[PDB]
Enzyme design. Structure first.
Site, PDB file in Angstrom:
ATOM      1  N   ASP D  38       0.834  -1.200   0.000  1.00 46.87           N
ATOM      2  CA  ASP D  38       0.000   0.000   0.000  1.00 46.87           C
ATOM      3  C   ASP D  38       0.869   1.251   0.000  1.00 46.87           C
ATOM      4  OD1 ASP D  38      -2.128   1.780   0.178  1.00 46.87           O
ATOM      5  OD2 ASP D  38      -2.748   1.167   2.183  1.00 46.87           O
ATOM      6  N   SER D  39       1.668   1.420   1.044  1.00 49.56           N
ATOM      7  CA  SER D  39       2.734   2.400   1.003  1.00 49.56           C
ATOM      8  C   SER D  39       3.932   1.822   0.253  1.00 49.56           C
ATOM      9  CB  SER D  39       3.127   2.826   2.415  1.00 49.56           C
ATOM     10  OG  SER D  39       3.675   1.740   3.140  1.00 49.56           O
ATOM     11  N   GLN D  42       3.112   3.522  -4.084  1.00 48.05           N
ATOM     12  CA  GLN D  42       2.407   4.703  -4.551  1.00 48.05           C
ATOM     13  C   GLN D  42       3.144   5.962  -4.129  1.00 48.05           C
ATOM     14  OE1 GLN D  42      -1.640   4.697  -3.151  1.00 48.05           O
ATOM     15  NE2 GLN D  42      -2.351   6.309  -4.535  1.00 48.05           N
TER      16      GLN D  42
END
Ligand SMILES: CCCCCCCCCCCCCCCCCC(=O)OC[C@H](COP(=O)([O-])OCC(O)COP(=O)([O-])OC[C@@H](COC(=O)CCCCCCCCCCCCCCCCC)OC(=O)CCCCCCCCCCCCCCCCC)OC(=O)CCCCCCCCCCCCCCCCC
Ligand SMILES: CCCCCCCCCCCCCCCCCC(=O)OC[C@H](COP(=O)(O)OCCN)OC(=O)CCCCCCCCCCCCCCCCC
Lengths: 55, 57, 458, 83, 107, 141, 51, 173, 114, 56
Positions: D38-39, D42
């Site tokens: 997720d981190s 992006q």
């Protein structure tokens, strides 16, 4: 995108540094004196501020 | 836009024009020609000194 | 004035006698021809004094003061044509005649030769100015401000008739200021205190104090169409010069009670400058500036002893041109933005670059740039009251520091970005907007070339 | 004084695909959509342009940057690119 | 040395001097060393803090500065000689505190 | 010509929920932490219902603030809390209250006592007694 | 040329302002107030000498 | 022009440059060229006006006044005699202003002449200027009656205090 | 100093229905941009937040006002307070200077100006 | 000796000439950074002259 080729700037820098280095060495070379100098700078008291710049 | 005198780069060390470096070289010497008058002839204290001025008798 | 009131009264049967829209170009044309006649017969020499003809004129010998009185009528007609042209022609011409009638009493005034003709001419105004506030003004709360425009000046001026006739029946006759050679002294009593009190307090009604001055940001806030009589109200406030006529003699030696007029006009001086840095109105912004360095001159007079009459002669005309010019700036930027609130004027300096020079030099007369007519007199107020004591430089110097911010607080408001709005305000400063904006500094720095005529007796 | 056109960014967005050693130079060029690669996927995928371009990358630039050509799309609107 | 009595004229800025003002003076060797001239000290424009010792040599050292107009140095040995007049005068005055530590204490 | 709720009125408890927002939408439905209760303390000449003060404050500071212009330049519609003090003022930095500058100015407060001392070059200190002997005591001979 | 671009610039206002000083000393009682001689010997401009 | 007794100064006394050296100096190249480029456009045109200005002459005359009364005439509440005495006294004051300006620049004649000594010489201007301005504010400066100009009604009455309280109330001078 | 300013707090899940306070302003923002975008406006927006600002600040404070508290009579400690104090300075002034000007002298003798 | 300070007043006058030519009174084909640089260029040797007379 560096660039250093403009003789407009080259005229400015060359005119200063010729006068800059001979600034204190021509003006003070010919001056009528006004006061009395120190003329005594003893041991451990004379030029150590230059050594302060060295460190 | 109008002129391509100095090329754009992508970190490949774009070279100089090899004429500014002559004037760069010249005024690195006449400033150290001025190491002449630093000592020759100029001293740190052209004065003379005191012998810890004792002899009052 | 041999024939100065005589040509200008003939200008009055020319407004409704004339044709259609020719009435503007005709009225301005005749008006400038009198301005040479003012300059010509005056400015003569000059050593105590020029008693002019007779019992109606003493020629304004010690202080000329009369040239400034005659610029304004060929100066406001070009200003009032911004928003006036919506009415009947017979109603618009009446608005022209009442302003011309305002000058004629003030032409006989400032010279006046006497004192019993002074007060009837000192009160000969306030009749045309009041009508200008009533009809063809701005939005409501006019009528109370018209009542506050009365009931102060008339409230204080009525003991002058109690004072002057009490002098006329007692010692000689006040027809002649020059037959005032024999003047008895005035000792401290409980009757003579009031004799000096009524002699002075009416003159504090017009040039204001920290007290009794609430009416002054009403006529300038709620004001006629675009600074029309507001320029005349500048001369109406500075035209309280008559303290120079009266208290030069006629109890001079009562200075024991001078102090609460010195002090109140001094802490109130530094206060009312800072009472407007959080004001939200443009026409109120110059109004509180016009209190402060107009309150500077009062301590130059009650303190006697010239090197104080020198600057005080010049400080009357100092803001008299300047605040008149600032109102010309404020009369503009209102035909284009129909609200006078200053905050809405973000995003200027780009649409109007030509008048942006005129903002600079105008506010450069409050910092005032010591080779001008402003800081040439304020140095003499320094030169007087420092001989009074050493403390007086403190509160008076901060006045030179607060208005440094308070003037540039307006200039920086012009410089902003992207302006958010304004499909209107297109007009790039037409001929009427900038030719009328001229002829203010154009005589002002001209007078700074040889400022010899701007000097009292003194 | 040097101008700029559309072709400079079409090099760099495609180049950092191969500069990042986690992403091989065998993906799609302009539209890889980043979910198939997720981190730190992006933010780290644009932490390199924080080094090279680095105009502080505002908060709305995250949710648009899935489509890798939609990364390239608004830069010409920001950088005021030719014609 | 100087300062006997009675400055007769009313001249302030003490150029009307007894003989010449020293730094403090004298004190011991010599107790009187006089000075130079005073009719030309005011005639030739010579400012204050210049009426001390080694003055007539300085009035001549300042002669060749004007008397050699397109010159960078008139006589460089003379500046080393006016300084030697100055520095030997100063070391002569440096014998005060050695005397003051010696003579002022109890004996 | 806007007469309906043209300004504030003698509040703040004349059915304060019907104040915001029948007009002057400082609060949405009188629970937004900006209902017109915040008449500071009244009795004075402060603000009444006053779509005015103690709402969240101390800066409009020209932020990033992209969802409208909305920071200080570009007119958000109706969010007036306080003005005429903020075109030149800001929010909190990383350090905190600690007035170390008076302690930093106290560095010469120790040397302010040193301003009473003297500054003669030669000789050295020897600060033990009157053997330093500053001025003239005796005569020539 | 370097014929009139500088001649209009510098060479014309020389004569005007020097006329404003020659017509000034004879009118104003304080002209140029040049100081003393500062002379250590005595010279040929005087008759005496100094050692 | 003027009169030299009004504005005295000692003579100029300019010495010799004393070159003494065979080195080339630039002062022998400056004064030998620049003098003729000034004398041609100035002095000849100054001569050209000099014949042209002498084409016609115009006269302007001195104004000398008439002073019959001085002080004590006349009685108290009068007008006629107390108007000429105002024209007496007030024009007897604007003369006394610029007399001081002569003596003020007389000090300025000494100070930018010597420069080096400048205090212990010239022997008059620290004294005589302070023998004028000291004898000025007494009885000729209406302190602080200068606002109403003190016209013959206070300038005599300072001098009433300069004779009643002064010189008799010293107990007993 | 001014301020901390408490730029961080807690959530999850305090006041779940408190959101869409932007729905108050985005409806106005939709009312803003629809007023802003038009082929012919030629004038300023009315913007009643500034209408309700100055008129409820410059005016309508004296109808709000009552002297029912002494913290409204607290202006006696700021207006007339130092105004006595400057005269309390100045009445001690100008007379001590006068007594040294009356009895004895201290001035220079060349004080014509003044 | 009169030209000791007369060249100073010439130096204190030619600065106004780019300002006098701002009133569009037959002004130069613009080149205004160049024209100002030329206007400074001749004042320096004018400024150089009375420095030699002072030190004598
Ligand atoms: C096609 C070619 C055509 C050829 C044209 C003719 C050739 C040129 C004419 C020759 C020069 C005359 C023009 C005057 C300037 C020079 C004055 C001078 O120095 O001579 C002294 C001479 C004085 O006469 P004097 O015989 O020596 O002695 C009499 C006095 O006692 C003397 O004492 P004083 O009482 O005069 O006191 C001195 C002072 C005092 O005078 C004043 O300042 C008083 C005026 C302001 C009073 C306050 C008014 C407030 C309302 O006077 C001055 O201000 C001199 C400053 C320069 C003049 C001011 C210019 C104002 C515009 O002339 C004057 O000063 C008279 C002043 C009249 C000003 C006229 C201005 C005309 C301007 C025309 C437009 C030109 C525009 C050019 C633009 C070019 C592109 C940028
Ligand atoms: C309140 C009014 C105060 C008046 C008190 C009475 C004054 C008086 O009696 O006259 C004083 C005096 C004349 O009376 P007298 O003492 O006998 O002198 C010898 C001549 N017979 O000498 C005079 O005639 C003095 C004349 C001036 C005094 C009258 C005006 C004083 C009131 C002005 C104060 C400001 C206005 C306040 C009212 C307006 C605001 C509401």
């Amino acid at each position: 995108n560096i660039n250093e080729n403009n003789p407009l700037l080259i005229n400015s820098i060359k005119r200063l540094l010729i006068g800059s280095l001979f600034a204190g060495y021509i003006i003070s070379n010919n001056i009528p004196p006004t006061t009395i100098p120190q003329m005594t700078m003893p041991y451990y008291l004379k030029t150590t501020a230059l050594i302060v710049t060295i460190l | 836009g109008g002129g391509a005198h100095i090329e754009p780069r992508y970190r490949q060390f774009p070279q100089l024009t090899r004429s500014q470096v002559i004037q760069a070289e010249f005024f690195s010497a006449t400033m150290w020609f001025w190491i002449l008058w630093r000592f020759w002839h100029d001293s740190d204290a052209v004065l003379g000194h005191f012998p810890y001025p004792d002899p009052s008798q | 004035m041999l024939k100065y009131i005589i040509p200008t009264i003939m200008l009055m049967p020319l407004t409704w006698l004339s044709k259609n829209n020719m009435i503007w170009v005709n009225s301005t044309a005749h008006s400038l021809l009198i301005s040479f006649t003012s300059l010509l017969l005056m400015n003569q020499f000059g050593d105590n004094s020029l008693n002019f003809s007779l019992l109606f004129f003493s020629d304004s010998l010690s202080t000329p003061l009369l040239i400034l009185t005659m610029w304004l009528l060929p100066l406001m007609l070009m200003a009032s044509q911004h928003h006036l042209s919506k009415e009947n022609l017979t109603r618009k011409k009446l608005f022209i005649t009442m302003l011309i009638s305002l000058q004629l009493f003030l032409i006989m005034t400032f010279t006046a030769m006497e004192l019993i003709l002074f007060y009837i001419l000192f009160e000969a105004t306030l009749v045309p100015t009041l009508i200008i506030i009533t009809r063809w003004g701005n939005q409501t709360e006019r009528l109370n401000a018209g009542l506050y425009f009365l009931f102060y000046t008339l409230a204080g001026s009525l003991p002058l008739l109690v004072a002057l006739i009490y002098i006329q029946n007692t010692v000689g006759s006040l027809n002649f200021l020059m037959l005032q050679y024999w003047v008895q002294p005035v000792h401290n009593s409980w009757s003579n205190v009031f004799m000096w009190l009524a002699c002075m307090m009416a003159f504090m009604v017009k040039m204001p104090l920290y007290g009794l001055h609430l009416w002054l940001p009403k006529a300038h806030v709620e004001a006629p169409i675009a600074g029309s009589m507001v320029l005349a109200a500048v001369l109406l406030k500075l035209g309280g010069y008559g303290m120079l006529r009266i208290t030069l003699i006629l109890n001079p030696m009562t200075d024991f009670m001078a102090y609460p007029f010195i002090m109140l006009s001094l802490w109130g001086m530094i206060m009312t400058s800072s009472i407007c840095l959080r004001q939200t109105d443009l026409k109120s912004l110059i109004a509180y500036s016009s209190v402060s360095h107009m309150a500077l001159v009062i301590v130059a007079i009650l303190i006697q002893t010239p090197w104080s009459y020198m600057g005080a002669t010049a400080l009357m005309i100092a803001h008299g041109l300047t605040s008149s010019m600032l109102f010309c700036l404020a009369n503009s930027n209102y035909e284009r933005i129909h609200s006078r609130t200053m905050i809405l004027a973000r995003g200027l300096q780009t649409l109007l670059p030509l008048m942006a020079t005129w903002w600079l030099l105008a506010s450069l007369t409050n910092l005032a740039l010591p080779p001008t007519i402003n800081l040439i007199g304020e140095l003499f107020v320094v030169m007087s009251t420092f001989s009074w004591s050493n403390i007086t430089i403190i509160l008076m110097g901060v006045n030179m520091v607060i208005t440094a911010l308070y003037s540039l607080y307006m200039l920086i408001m012009t410089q902003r970005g992207k302006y958010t709005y304004h499909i209107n305000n297109i007009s790039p400063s037409f001929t009427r907007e900038n030719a009328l904006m001229s002829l203010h500094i154009l005589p002002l720095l001209l007078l700074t070339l040889n400022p010899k005529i701007i000097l009292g007796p003194l | 004084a040097p101008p700029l056109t559309l072709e400079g960014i079409k090099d760099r967005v495609l180049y950092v695909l191969k500069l990042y050693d986690k992403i091989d130079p065998e993906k799609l060029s302009v539209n890889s959509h980043f979910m198939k690669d997720d981190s730190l996927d992006q933010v780290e995928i644009i932490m390199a342009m924080e080094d090279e371009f680095g105009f502080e990358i505002p908060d709305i630039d995250a949710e648009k940057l899935m489509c890798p050509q939609e990364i390239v799309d608004y830069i010409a609107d920001k950088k005021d690119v030719y014609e | 040395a100087r300062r006997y009595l009675g400055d007769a004229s009313v001249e302030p800025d003490p150029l009307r001097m007894p003989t010449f003002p020293p730094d403090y003076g004298f004190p011991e060797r010599k107790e009187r060393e006089m000075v130079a001239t005073q009719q030309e000290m005011n005639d030739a424009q010579l400012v204050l803090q210049q009426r001390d010792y080694c003055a007539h040599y300085l009035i001549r050292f300042l002669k060749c500065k004007r008397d050699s107009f397109p010159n960078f140095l008139a006589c460089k040995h003379e500046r080393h000689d006016w300084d030697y007049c100055e520095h030997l005068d100063y070391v002569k005055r440096m014998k005060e505190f050695e005397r003051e530590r010696r003579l002022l204490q109890r004996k | 010509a806007s007469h309906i709720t043209k300004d504030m009125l003698p509040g703040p408890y004349p059915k304060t929920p019907e104040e915001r927002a029948a007009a002057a939408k400082k609060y949405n439905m009188r629970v937004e932490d900006y209902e017109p209760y915040p008449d500071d303390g009244t009795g004075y000449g402060d603000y009444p219902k006053l779509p005015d003060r103690s709402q969240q404050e101390r800066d409009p500071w020209y932020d990033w603030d992209h969802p409208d212009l909305r920071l200080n330049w570009g007119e958000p519609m109706h969010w007036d809390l306080d003005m005429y003090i903020r075109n030149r003022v800001d929010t909190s930095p990383t350090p905190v209250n600690w007035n170390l500058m008076c302690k930093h100015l106290f560095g010469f407060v120790a040397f302010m006592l040193f301003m009473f001392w003297v500054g003669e070059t030669y000789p050295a200190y020897q600060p033990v007694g009157p053997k330093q002997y500053p001025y003239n005591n005796l005569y020539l001979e | 040329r370097h014929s009139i671009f500088a001649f209009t610039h510098v060479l014309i206002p020389v004569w005007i302002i020097h006329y404003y000083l020659k017509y000034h000393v004879t009118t104003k009682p304080y002209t140029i107030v040049e100081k003393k001689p500062r002379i250590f010997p005595g010279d040929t401009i005087l008759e005496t000498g100094e050692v | 022009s003027w009169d030299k007794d009004v504005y005295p100064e000692p003579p100029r006394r300019t010495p010799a440059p004393s070159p003494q050296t065979s080195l080339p100096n630039p002062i022998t190249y400056l004064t030998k060229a620049f003098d003729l480029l000034v004398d041609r456009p100035v002095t000849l045109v100054r001569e050209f006006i000099e014949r042209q200005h002498a084409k016609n002459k115009y006269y302007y005359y001195h104004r000398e006044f008439r002073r019959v009364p001085d002080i004590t005439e006349c009685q108290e509440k009068d007008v006629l005699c107390m108007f000429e005495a105002e024209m007496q006294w007030r024009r007897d004051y604007k003369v006394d202003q610029e007399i001081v300006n002569i003596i003020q620049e007389r000090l300025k004649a000494c100070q930018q002449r010597e420069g080096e000594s400048h205090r212990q010489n010239c022997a008059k201007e620290l004294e005589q200027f302070t023998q004028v301005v000291k004898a000025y504010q007494d009885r000729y400066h209406d302190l602080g009656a200068h606002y109403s100009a003190r016209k013959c009604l206070a300038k005599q009455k300072q001098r009433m205090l300069a004779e009643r309280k002064a010189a008799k109330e010293a107990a007993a001078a | 100093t001014t301020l901390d300013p408490a730029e961080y707090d807690i959530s999850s899940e305090t006041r779940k229905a408190q959101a869409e306070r932007l729905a108050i302003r985005s409806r106005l923002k939709r009312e803003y941009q629809l007023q802003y975008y038009d082929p012919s406006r030629r004038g300023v927006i009315e913007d009643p937040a500034l209408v309700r600002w100055t008129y409820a600040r410059s005016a309508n404070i004296y109808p709000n006002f009552r002297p029912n508290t002494k913290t409204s009579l607290l202006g006696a400690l700021f207006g007339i307070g130092p105004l006595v104090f400057w005269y309390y300075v100045f009445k001690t002034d100008r007379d001590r200077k006068e007594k040294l000007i009356q009895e004895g002298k201290l001035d220079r003798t060349f004080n014509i100006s003044y | 000796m009169n030209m000791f300070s007369s060249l100073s007043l010439v130096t204190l006058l030619l600065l106004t000439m780019p300002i006098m030519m701002m009133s569009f009174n037959t002004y130069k084909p613009s080149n205004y950074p160049l024209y100002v640089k030329t206007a400074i260029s001749y004042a320096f040797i004018t400024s150089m002259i009375p420095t030699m007379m002072f030190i004598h």
